[PDB]
Write a protein that binds this DNA or RNA. Structure first.
Lengths: 148, 94, 38, 141, 66
RNA sequence: AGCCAGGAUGUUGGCUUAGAAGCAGCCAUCAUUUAAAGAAAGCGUAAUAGCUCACUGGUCGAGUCGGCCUGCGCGGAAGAU
């Protein structure tokens, strides 16, 4: 490994994603294959490319060293194996969705999805999301309200 | 930067020199300037580790011989014919 | 097993053991590497 | 495909799917049907092009028949009909012999867009650097 | 085939077996059948005819002294 | 150090070979995707296949690694009343 001069970058970089981010998910990759990463990188791909991460770090000692910053709801995620996912642009989006759909294709556990932060809380798969731009679901709420 | 503590030699000659070397010390001498030469005795393992760096032979370096700081340059070294140890050093006064 | 006077590891799996007064070599992969009189 | 089971790739040919000395039998003989790669392959052959290198995987269990898959061409080979020289040395690579087309290497690599990890299609280029410094043949960039 | 001081030249993979092609010296093929069998559980035809003359390795040559 | 995981894509790099697909040889040893993963440290193969390592993620929970100099010891060490 590297000394501190390197354990600091994995911090100053990874914590300015939290400081400058959008949504957060969860997942434990016990059996995390590489067809695994391959896929989810195309997903990050659709979800821009390299706007996304997953930098395995669940050393509390790392991606909690980014938490007493923001998201101290994660002192509780960080135990055991974890795969932290941050969003920069994009809706508070679909990121959420396929992690459940992925891991529900066996694709290993999902930490039961211990969940995360947009609010400041816990678990439950939501597509309360990428409807986003479904302001059309407030366009159809126009003419249909005007007519009916 | 190299700080070398040392002591003036109380004994000189083949007899003493050998004795010193049995006790992980080793003789060396400071000469140069317009003032007399000085018979030094140095701690071995120390100068060894120090002289491991190449700067030892380039940089000016300082010897604290009975509280003075003489400040000198390494002229010449005597290494053991077949061991990894030092026999003697010539220091030039700078 | 080979007997020899100099024994030494051969495979990365050869192991070296001091049983009784005698120095040995045990390989979990390759029987040819057993050694004694070490 | 979320589960591999059987795959042997031995670059075939399009214009007539009916070999015998190169592959022929050895392409289908363990629950595989020699009768159906001339019924099925050529059904996915003529839409594109014919003659040149075709690695391939098939869907044969022990289920009599099957369904054929397609693939992609080798990448240092697109430096033959897609560069110049067709060997790679002549003076063993104690000598840096070859010679490149910088324009090519991107769009000629890009032709292999469907089988690479780089997000940045420029990245997919940077891979072809070493793939094309495979001898030490410098590119006139 | 190689052990028998032989040069190999091709392989087909003809249907079920695999025809192997080689140039191997005569004074060296004697009793092939017997061993070819041992190596392939009895399942292995073979065939040979004359092709050419090439230099005999020295220890061979100096042996062949009448 | 154990134990769980992964240990990947260009791609069998190129050359050379009947075959050299990480691994007989020669030259190169980059670039991706990354948490990390050698154009490969060893097993293996006709060659592929197959099993490991380096490396990184997890678990664990405080010491731990290997060179230099030196003291004393061990093997090496079989003979005839």
């Amino acid at each position: 490994m590297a000394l501190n001069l390197q354990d600091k970058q994995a911090i100053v970089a990874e914590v300015s994603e939290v400081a400058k981010g959008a949504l957060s998910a969860v997942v434990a990759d016990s059996r995390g294959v590489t067809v695994d990463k391959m896929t989810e990188l195309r997903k990050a791909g659709r979800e821009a490319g390299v706007y996304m991460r997953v930098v395995r770090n669940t050393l509390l000692r790392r991606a909690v060293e980014g938490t007493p910053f923001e998201c101290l709801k994660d002192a509780f995620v960080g135990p055991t194996l974890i795969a932290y996912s941050m969003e920069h642009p994009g809706a508070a989006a679909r990121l959420f969705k396929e992690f459940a759909k992925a891991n529900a294709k066996f694709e290993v556990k999902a930490a039961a999805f211990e969940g995360e932060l947009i609010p400041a809380s816990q678990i439950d798969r939501l597509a309360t999301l990428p409807t986003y731009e479904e302001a059309i679901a407030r366009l159809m709420a126009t003419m249909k309200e005007a007519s009916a | 930067m190299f700080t070398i503590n040392a002591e003036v030699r109380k004994e000189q000659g083949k007899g003493a020199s050998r004795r010193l070397r049995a006790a992980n010390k080793f003789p060396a001498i400071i000469y140069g300037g317009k003032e007399a030469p000085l018979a030094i005795e140095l701690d071995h393992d120390k100068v060894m580790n120090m002289q491991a760096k190449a700067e030892f032979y380039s940089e000016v370096l300082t010897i604290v011989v009975d509280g003075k700081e003489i400040k000198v340059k390494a002229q010449d070294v005597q290494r053991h014919p077949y061991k990894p140890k030092l026999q003697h050093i010539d220091f030039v006064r700078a | 097993m080979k007997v020899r006077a100099s024994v030494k590891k051969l495979c990365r799996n050869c192991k070296i053991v001091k049983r009784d007064g005698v120095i040995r070599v045990i390989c979990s992969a390759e029987p040819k590497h057993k050694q004694r009189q070490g | 495909a979320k589960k591999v089971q059987a795959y042997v790739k031995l670059q075939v040919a399009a214009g007539m799917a009916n070999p015998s000395p190169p592959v022929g039998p050895a392409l289908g003989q363990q629950g595989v049907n020699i009768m159906e790669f001339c019924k099925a392959f050529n059904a996915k052959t003529d839409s594109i092009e014919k003659g040149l290198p075709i690695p391939v995987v098939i869907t044969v269990y022990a289920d009599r028949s099957f369904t054929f898959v397609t693939k992609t061409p080798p990448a240092a080979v697109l430096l033959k009909k897609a560069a110049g020289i067709k060997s790679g040395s002549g003076k063993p690579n104690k000598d840096k012999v070859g010679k490149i087309s910088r324009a090519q290497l991107q769009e000629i690599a890009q032709t292999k867009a469907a089988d690479m990890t780089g997000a940045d299609i420029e990245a997919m280029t940077r891979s072809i650097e070493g793939t094309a410094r495979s001898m030490g043949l410098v590119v006139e960039d | 085939l190689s052990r028998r001081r032989g040069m190999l030249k091709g392989q087909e993979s003809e249907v079920t077996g695999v025809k192997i092609h080689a140039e191997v010296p005569l004074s060296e093929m004697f009793g092939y059948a017997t061993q070819l069998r041992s190596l392939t559980k009895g399942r292995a035809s073979y065939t040979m005819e004359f092709l050419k003359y090439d230099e005999a390795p020295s220890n061979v040559a100096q042996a062949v002294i009448e």
